[PDB]
Amino acid sequence: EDKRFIHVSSRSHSRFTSTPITPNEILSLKFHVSGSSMAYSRMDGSLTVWFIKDASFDKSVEVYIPDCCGSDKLATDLSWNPTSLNQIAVVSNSSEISLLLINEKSLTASKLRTLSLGSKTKVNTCLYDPLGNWLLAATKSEKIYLFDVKKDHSSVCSLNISDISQEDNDVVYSLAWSNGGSHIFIGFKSGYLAILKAKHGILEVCTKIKAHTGPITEIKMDPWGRNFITGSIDGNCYVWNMKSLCCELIINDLNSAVTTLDVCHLGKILGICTEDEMVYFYDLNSGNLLHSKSLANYKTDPVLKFYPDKSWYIMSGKNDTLSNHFVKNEKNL
Amino acid sequence: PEMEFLQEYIQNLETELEEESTKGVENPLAMAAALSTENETGKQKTQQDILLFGKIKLLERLLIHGCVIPVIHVLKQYPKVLYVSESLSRYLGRVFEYLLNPLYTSMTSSGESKDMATALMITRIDNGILAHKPRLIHKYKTHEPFESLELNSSYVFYYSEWNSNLTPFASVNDLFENSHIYLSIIGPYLGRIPTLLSKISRIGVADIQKNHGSESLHVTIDKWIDYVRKFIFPATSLLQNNPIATSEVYELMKFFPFEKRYFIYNEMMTKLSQDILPLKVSFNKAEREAKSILKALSIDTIAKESRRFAKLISTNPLASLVPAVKQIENYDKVSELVVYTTKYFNDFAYDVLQFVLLLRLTYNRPAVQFDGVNQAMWVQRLSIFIAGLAKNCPNMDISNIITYILKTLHNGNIIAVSILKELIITVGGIRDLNEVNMKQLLMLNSGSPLKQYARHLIYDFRDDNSVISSRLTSFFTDQSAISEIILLLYTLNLKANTQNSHYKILSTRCDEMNTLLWSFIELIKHCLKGKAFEENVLPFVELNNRFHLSTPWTFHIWRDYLDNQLNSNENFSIDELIEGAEFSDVDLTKISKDLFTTFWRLSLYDIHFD
Amino acid sequence: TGFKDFLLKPELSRAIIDCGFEHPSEVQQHTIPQSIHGTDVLCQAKSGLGKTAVFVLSTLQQLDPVPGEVAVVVICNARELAYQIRNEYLRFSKYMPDVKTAVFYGGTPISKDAELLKNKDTAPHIVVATPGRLKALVREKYIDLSHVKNFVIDECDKVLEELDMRRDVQEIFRATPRDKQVMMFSATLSQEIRPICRRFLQNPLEIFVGLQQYYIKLEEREKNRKLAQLLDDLEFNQVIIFVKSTTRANELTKLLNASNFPAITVHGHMKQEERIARYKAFKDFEKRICVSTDVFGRGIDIERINLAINYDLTNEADQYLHRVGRAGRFGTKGLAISFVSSKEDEEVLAKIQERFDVKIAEFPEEGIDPSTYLNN
C-alpha cells in the first residue's frame, strides 16, 4: 500500500505553468467484466480506452483520441459488450449509435457499424445485459427501446414512459439491469422505483414503489444477488433486499446529496460520494453506519468506480482533473 | 438471580428512564460544559451478570430454538422483563416473521415469484480463454440465529429443525388471531424490527386492492381501522431515523376516512404521557431534537440542516412539529427557513402538518387583543406560513384548511379573513389600485400588451404564477365554494355597519373588507377563463333577485364576459343584450333604458383611445 | 399609512408600504413638508432617529426626469456613508425605471468613472459623493453642475469645520447656480458653527434640540458550565454575549464552533473593513451567535435579538441600560441575564433597583416559564 501517481497527459498539463483550465471534464466510466479494459471519457477532450497487461500503471500508454465520435457532438455513456471483447457501444448525443473496435497492434481505432432507429431525439443511456444478449437504449424524454446483439442489432419492442407512471413529465435519471438479466429497475425523478419485465423481447412493468421524495440518482446491485442499493438527492441510501422487496439497512449520514454509489465484487464495502467533496465507505452485512474511512476531496467534482475482478480503488479528484489508483488497500489504515 | 432480586432491578431501571424523561441531564459531553478555562478575572459488575448470565439468557435462548410456549407464559406474568435486553425483542420478531412469510408471498405473488428469478449472482469470467464460471460458496454452522455471508462462505443456524413446532397460517383470519398473542407482548416495540412493520402493512394494502370489487369494502376497511390503532401506529413512534418504513404505514392509511385518521393522530398525544413508558421516553427524545435544530437554523448552513430536519419530521412528526410550529407564530425569518425544508417531506408529514396547523388555529387564545385596535401578533405570522406552503410545495393538499375558512366565516371570524387575504396576494399576484399613478391608471384600461406592461410596473405578477393560482382555485371549485365566498364577504361587510366598537376602526375595517371582495373577484376572472366560469358563479338574473348585492357589484363580475360574446359574432351579439331580469335598485320608467344600460355595459376600454 | 399623510406623489407612496415604515419621527414631522415648498432647512436632531429619511423623500418629488443631466447633489463625510445613501435612494425608487443613482468616493480611478458618467446607460439624475472626490471631477470638464436644483449637505458641522474640507465644498457651490435649494442636516449643532453655516442659505427654517431582568448569584467557576446550560434551555432568536475583554472573547468562539454553535467575532483590535462585513452577515441572518466587547453597547438596532447575557457584569448603571436596550425593541419581549462573580457586583444592582425602580428578581431553581416571554 503506497501512493502511486497516474500517468496520463493530465499530470503534464498541471505540471506546466498553465493557468486557466488544464483538462476539462469527465462524462462516463465503464468497465468490461474481464477487468483489464477501461472507458475513460471526457467532455471536449478524449475518450481513452486502456489496456495495461501486467504492471500497476507504469507499463504503457495505449491510446488517446479526440476525434473518435466525430468533431461536433459528445458521448453520454460507453457500454461495453460482454460477449465480444473488441466491441464498445458508444452512443453520441444527437443521433449516433456507433460501434467501435480497438486494435492492439496499431495506434488506431476502427468502426464496425453505425446503426440508428429514426426519430431519435436524444439517447443518453445505453447498457448491455450482464450476459450480453440485449441492449436497452432509453431516452429521458419520450420512450425506451429494446434491441438484441446475438444475431445483430435489430429492434423488437418499445414502451412509452407515460404508461409506467402517471403524475407529470418525469425524467429518467438512472436505470439498472437486473443481475439475472430478466428485470429492469428504473429510477424516476419524483422518487418512483418501477420494475419492468424484460425476458426476451417483451417489455412490461410489474409494480412501482415510492422509495423517497427526490431524484433517485444511482441504482447498484449486489454480486451475491441478495439486495440492491439506491441513492438520492436527499441523504438517504437505503438497502432493499430482493426476496421480500423491503428495506434492511439505512445509511442515514445526511450531510449532503448523493451522487455516486459503488459496491465491491465481494459485496462488502459500499462507497458513497457526496456533493461536499466528501467520500465514505460502509458495510452491507454489518450494521447501519459503520464507516471504514472518510476522505476529504479537493475543490473539483470527483468520480468513484470499482474494478469487477479484484478490489482496487479508482477515484478522481486532483487539482483540476486526474484519477488516482490506490494499490493493495485491503486494510485502508 | 432470584425473583425478588430481579424485580428490584426492574424498578431501578424504570425510575432511571422516567428521571431522564421528565427533565434529566442533557449533553454533559459538550466542549463547553466539560472544559472550564478563564484567563483573567461496586454494583456495576453485579448488573453486568444479569444480562449475560442467568434467567434472561435462558429466556432468550429458548426463543432462538423454538420454545415459544414457556416464554409467552413468562412475559405475561412479568411484562417489565423487557426494557432490560434489546435482544429479547428481535427474537419475538424472527419467530413472527416465519409465520407470515408464506402469507406475504401469496398476496404479492407474481412480483416475488419472479424475484427468485431476480436473486441470481454474477458469474466470474476469465480474460485469457473467455471462460464462464459460477461462484463457489461454503456452508458452515454457527450458534447465531441470523444468517450471514462472509467473503467466501455462508453461516447458517445449526439447529435446522428449529421451526417444526411452529406452523404458518391462512389469509387474514389467523393473522388477526396470532397477533393478540405475539404482538401484545412486544406492544410498542416493533420499531426495533422495522422490516416486520412493512410486511404487515403491505398485506393490508394488498388486501383492500384484492377485495376492491364493489361489495366487501365497508367491513374490510373497518377491520384494519382497529389493527392500525391498536398495534401498528404506536409501534411507529418508537422509530428514530426511518423515512421509508413510515410511508408504508401511511400507504395503508390513505384508504381510511380523514375523520378517523385525526382520531388516531389525537390519541397519540394524550396517550403519550399518561400511558405506556418507552414511547414517552421517545416522544421526549424528539422534542429535544426538534428544538436543537431551530436554534442552529441559519441561512448558510441550510443546505445541510434542511435534509437533517426533514428526515426527523419524516419519522416522528407528532413530536417534531408542535415545537416547530410554536416558533413560527412567535418568530419570523425562520418561517422562510421552514418552508425551504418542506420540499423534502414525505406524504405522511403533509397530513400531520395540516393537522398541526388546524390544532393551532382553534386553540383557546384571545384572537383579538386587549383593546381591539390590533388583532394579535400570531394571527398575521401564521397566515404567511399557510400561504407560503401553498406557493412553494405542490404536494400538500390544503383542502381542510380551506374548509375551515368556509364554515367560520358564517360566524364572523378574524382569523379566516386574515388567512384568505394573504392567500390572494401571495399565490396570485393581485395588487390593490389605491396608490396608482394616473398615467398607469389609463394604461391599465387599454386592453393590450401595455396592460401587461402596466402590471409589470405596479408589481402585479399574474403571468408568472398562473399555474399556482389555478391550483388554488381548484380547491375552491371542488367544494363549490366560489359562489359562497362572494356572498359571505359581502354580507359580513354589510353586517359591520351596525357593530359599535370604535369610530376610526370601522372606517378602516369597512375599507379593508371592501378591497378583499374586489380582490377575490379579480382572481376568479383570471383562473376560470372560458366555459368554466358560468357553472361556478351565479347568473345575475338570480344574483340580483334571490340575493340582493347591489348594482355596481353585480355588473362588476359580468362585464368582461359579455364583452367577448359581443365581438364574437353578430348572431352572438343579439344574445347578451336581451339577457336581463328585474332590477331592484333602479327603475327603468323615467331613465331611458337604451342609455341607462349602456352606462354599466361599457368599460373604459372603448371610451378613450390614444 | 402615516406616510401617505405626507400628501406625496402616488408613485413615491407605493414603495413606502414595501419599505415597512408607518410612523413618522418628530424630526421628520417638522421639516419635510415645508421642504417640499422649496425653502431651505436647518436641522438639529439625535443620531439614528430618522435624519437620513428627511432628504430622500424630499428630493424624489421635486425632480423632473431629463435625459443626461444631474439634478440632486449630496455631499457627505466619508466613503462609507455615501454607499448607504445610494442603497436608500434606489429603494424608494424601485418602481421608477427612468431615474438612476451612482456613488463617488476615493480610491477609484476618476477616468474610469468618467466612462461611467459619459455612457448614458449609467448617467444618473442623482449623484452622491464625498466632496474630497466631487471636487476632483469638475476640474477636468467631466460633469456639469448647471442643471441642478437641489443641494444636500449632511453632517454640515463636521464637514465645514476642517479647513481642508472647507475648500472643496466652496468650489462646488460656486460651480452651481445660487437660485437653488440647499439642504443642511447634522447631528450636533453648537452655537459656534451656526454663524458660520448660514452663508449658503436664503431664509432658512431652524430646528434645534417590558424586559424581564434576572441575575444569577453564583461563585467564580460555575459560569463556563452555566453557559452551555443557559443556551440549551432557552428558545432564542439571536443571542449576544458581552465580554469585558478581548482575550476571553476569542477563546470562547473557538470553544463554541466546536460545540456546534457557529459564531462570529466583532469588536476593536481588528480591521474596520472586517468590522463592517462581519456585522453585516449578523444582520443577514448568516449566524445567530455573536460575542462582542463594550463597543456594541450603545445604539445598535437589530430587532432579532431577544437574549442578552452578561458574561462579565458592569460596574455602573449607565452602561447596563444600553446593553439590554437592544433586546425587546418596540414592545417586544426579551431577557437580561447577568453573571455575578465578584464583590463589587452586588453593589451595582443595589443601586439599580433604587434608581430605575426595576426589581431584578432572583433566578428560580426550576427555570422560567416558556409562556411568559413568548405568549405574555
Q: Residue A298: CB partners within 8 Å, gap ≥ 6?
A: A277, A317, A318, A319
Go through B531-548 and write b for each residue having 16 or more CB atoms within 10 A of its CB, e for each that does not. Answer: eebeeebbebeebbeeee
Q: Which helix (H) or strand (E) holds B449?
A: helix B449-457
Three-state DSSP class for residue B148: strand
Among residues 154-183 of chain B, which lie with CB inside 8 Å of chain C? none
Tell me the one-letter amino acid at B249: V
| DSSP letter string, B7-27 | HHHHHHHHHHHHHHHHT----
Q: Same domain for C226 and C327? A: yes
Q: B198 and A224 in contact by Cβ < 8 A?
A: no
C-alpha grid cell for residue B163? 421451526
- Comparing CA positions, the residue from C319, C302, C295 lying closest to residue C48 is C302
Q: Same domain for C216 and C130? A: no
A213 → closest Cβ in B105, B245, B345:
B345
C-alpha grid cell for residue B24? 434529566
- Comparing CA positions, the residue from C249, C284, C281 lying closest to residue C265 is C249
Specify the DSSP class assigned to residue B251: H
Going from the C-alpha of A267 to that of each of A110, B136, B420, the distances in angstroms are 37, 15, 56
- Comparing CA positions, the residue from C18, C54, C60 lying closest to residue C33 is C54
What is the C-alpha to C-alpha distance for residues A41 and C255, in angstroms, rounded to an integer? 47
Go through A296-330 and write b for each residue having 16 or more CB atoms within 10 A of its CB, e for each that does not. Answer: ebeeeebbbbbbbeebebbbbbbebbbbbbeeeee
Q: Residue A181: CB partners within 8 Å, gap ≥ 6?
A: A129, A130, A131, A133, A134
What is the C-alpha to C-alpha distance for residues A182 and B114, in angstroms, rounded to an integer? 9
- Comparing CA positions, the residue from A236, A238, A239 lying closest to residue A258 is A236
What is the C-alpha to C-alpha distance for residues C146 and C292, in angstroms, rounded to an integer? 49
C-alpha grid cell for residue A221? 446491485
Elucidation technique: cryo-EM
Residue of B nearest to A240 (CA): B195
CA angle C100, B433, C18 (to 5 degrees): 50
Q: Which helix (H) or strand (E) holds B442?
A: helix B438-443
Q: Same domain for C217 and C194? A: no
What is the C-alpha to C-alpha distance for residues B560 and B347, in angstroms, rounded to an integer? 41
Q: Which helix (H) or strand (E) holds B132?
A: strand B132-133
Q: Same domain for C259 and C274? A: yes
Q: A254 and B247 in contact by Cβ < 8 A?
A: no
C-alpha grid cell for residue A146? 429494446
B298 → closest Cβ in C11, C232, C285:
C285
Tell me the one-letter amino acid at B413: N
Going from the C-alpha of B246 to that of each of B80, B239, B270, C246, the distances in angstroms are 27, 9, 21, 51
What is the C-alpha to C-alpha distance for residues A279 and C281, in angstroms, rounded to an integer? 31
Measured in residues, chain C has a length of 376
Q: Which helix (H) or strand (E) holds B419?
A: helix B414-426
Query: What φ, ψ does residue A312 adopt, rounded to 5°?
Result: -130, 140
What is the C-alpha to C-alpha distance for residues B8 and B3, in angstroms, rounded to an integer? 9
Q: Which helix (H) or strand (E) holds B140?
A: strand B139-142
Q: Same domain for C3 and C31? A: yes
Q: Residue B149: CB partners within 8 Å, gap ≥ 6?
A: A224, A226, A267, A285, B155
Going from the C-alpha of C187 to that of each of B556, C89, C190, C319, the distances in angstroms are 54, 21, 10, 22
Q: Residue C58: CB partners within 8 Å, gap ≥ 6?
A: C32, C35, C36, C183
Q: Same domain for C165 and C223? A: no
C-alpha grid cell for residue B226? 382497529
Longest dimension (CA), chain C: 74
**Sign of torsion, CA B489 B494 B499 B500?**
positive
Going from the C-alpha of A141 to that of each of A95, A124, A177, B80, the distances in angstroms are 14, 10, 20, 58
Q: Which helix (H) or strand (E) holds B351?
A: helix B349-361
Radius of gyration of chain B (CA): 34
Place of cell 345575475: B540
C-alpha grid cell for residue C188? 450636533
What is the spatial order of strands in the sheet that A294-296 belongs to? A258-262, A271-274, A278-280, A294-296
| Domain final position from C207, C238, C257 | C207
Residue of A nearest to B345 (CA): A213
**Ligand-binding site membership of C189 (annotated):** no
| DSSP letter string, B35-94 | ----S----TTTTTTTTSSSHHHHHHHHHHHT--HHHHHHHHH-GGGSSS-GGGTTHHHH
In chain B, residues with a C-beta closer than 8 Å to the C-beta of A287 are: none
In chain B, residues with a C-beta closer than 8 Å to the C-beta of A183 are: 114, 117-118
Three-state DSSP class for residue B363: coil
Q: Same domain for C166 and C294? A: no
By CB neighbour count within 10 A (0-12 exposed, 13-18 middle, 19+ buried), where does A19 fall? exposed
Give me the half-sphere count of Cα atoms (radius 13 Å) on the Cβ side of residue C111: 0
Cβ pair A223, A200 in contact under 8 A: no
- Comparing CA positions, the residue from A53, A49, A56 lying closest to residue A103 is A49
Measured in residues, chain B has a length of 610
Q: Among A199, A245, A288, A307, which would you mutate to test the B interface (most chain B Cβ atoms within 10 Å of its Cβ)?
A: A245
In chain C, residues with a C-beta closer than 8 Å to the C-beta of B30 are: 228, 259
What is the C-alpha to C-alpha distance for residues C285 and C54, in angstroms, rounded to an integer? 29
Q: Same domain for C369 and C233? A: yes
C-alpha grid cell for residue B160? 435446522
Go through C145-154 and write b for each residue having 16 or more CB atoms within 10 A of its CB, e for each that does not. Answer: beebbbbbbb
Cβ pair B176, B203 in contact under 8 A: no
Q: SS3 string of A138-167?
A: EECCCEEEEEECCCCCCEEEEEEHHHCCCC
Cβ pair B482, B527 in contact under 8 A: no
Q: Same domain for C139 and C169? A: yes
| DSSP letter string, B219-235 | HHHHHTHHHHHHHTSTT
Residue of B nearest to C286 (CA): B299
Number of domains, chain C: 2
What is the C-alpha to C-alpha distance for residues A330 and C224, in angstroms, rounded to an integer? 46
Tell me the one-letter amino acid at B99: L
- Comparing CA positions, the residue from B349, B264, B282, B339 lying closest to residue B314 is B349
> For this experimental structure, what is the resolution in angstroms?
3.4
Place of cell 429494446: A146
Radius of gyration of chain A (CA): 20
Q: C288 and B40 in contact by Cβ < 8 A?
A: no
| A and C touch per CB criterion (3+ pairs under 8 A) | no
What is the C-alpha to C-alpha distance for residues C343 and C351, in angstroms, rounded to an integer? 14
Q: Same domain for C194 and C324? A: no
Cβ pair A274, A255 in contact under 8 A: yes
- Distance (Å) from the C-alpha of residue C292 to the closest C-alpha of chain B? 17
Q: Residue B411: CB partners within 8 Å, gap ≥ 6?
A: none
| Domain final position from C207, C226, C251 | C207
Place of cell 479484484: A310
Cβ pair A76, A27 in contact under 8 A: yes
Q: Same domain for C26 and C175? A: yes
Q: Same domain for C176 and C325? A: no
Q: SS3 string of chain A?
A: CCEECCCCCHHHHHHCCCCCCCCCCCCCEECCCCCCCCEECCCCCCCEECCCCCCCCCCCCCCCCCCCCCCCCCEEEEEECCCCCCCEEEEECCCCEEEEEECCCCCCEEEEEEECCCCCCCEEEEEECCCCCEEEEEECCCEEEEEECCCCCCEEEEEEHHHCCCCCCCCCCEEEECCCCCEEEEECCCCEEEEEEECCCCEEEEEEEECCCCCCCCEEECCCCCEEEECCCCCCCEEEECCCCCEEEECCCCCCCEEEEECCCCCCCCEEEECCCEEECCCCCCCCCCCCCEEECCCCCCCEEECCCCCCEEEECCCCCCEEEECCCCCCC
What is the C-alpha to C-alpha distance for residues C336 and C328, in angstroms, rounded to an integer? 10
Find how far residue B459's CA is from the centre of its chain.
33
What is the C-alpha to C-alpha distance for residues B561 and B559, in angstroms, rounded to an integer? 5
Q: Among A37, A38, A193, A213, which would you mutate to test the B interface (most chain B Cβ atoms within 10 Å of its Cβ)?
A: A213
B371 lies within 8 A of chain C by CB? no
Q: Residue A92: CB partners within 8 Å, gap ≥ 6?
A: A69, A70, A73, A74, A75, A98
In chain B, residues with a C-beta closer than 8 Å to the C-beta of A267 are: 149
C-alpha grid cell for residue C45? 436632531
Q: Which domain holds residue C225?
A: 212-376
**Ligand-binding site membership of C45 (annotated):** yes
What is the C-alpha to C-alpha distance for residues B216 and A29, in angstroms, rounded to an integer? 54
- Comparing CA positions, the residue from C182, C185, C132 lying closest to residue C156 is C185
Q: Which helix (H) or strand (E) holds B466?
A: helix B466-478
Give me the half-sphere count of Cα atoms (radius 13 Å) on the Cβ side of residue B183: 24
Strand partners, C214: C337, C361
Cβ pair C77, B437 in contact under 8 A: no
| C and B touch per CB criterion (3+ pairs under 8 A) | yes
| Domain final position from C170, C191, C207 | C207
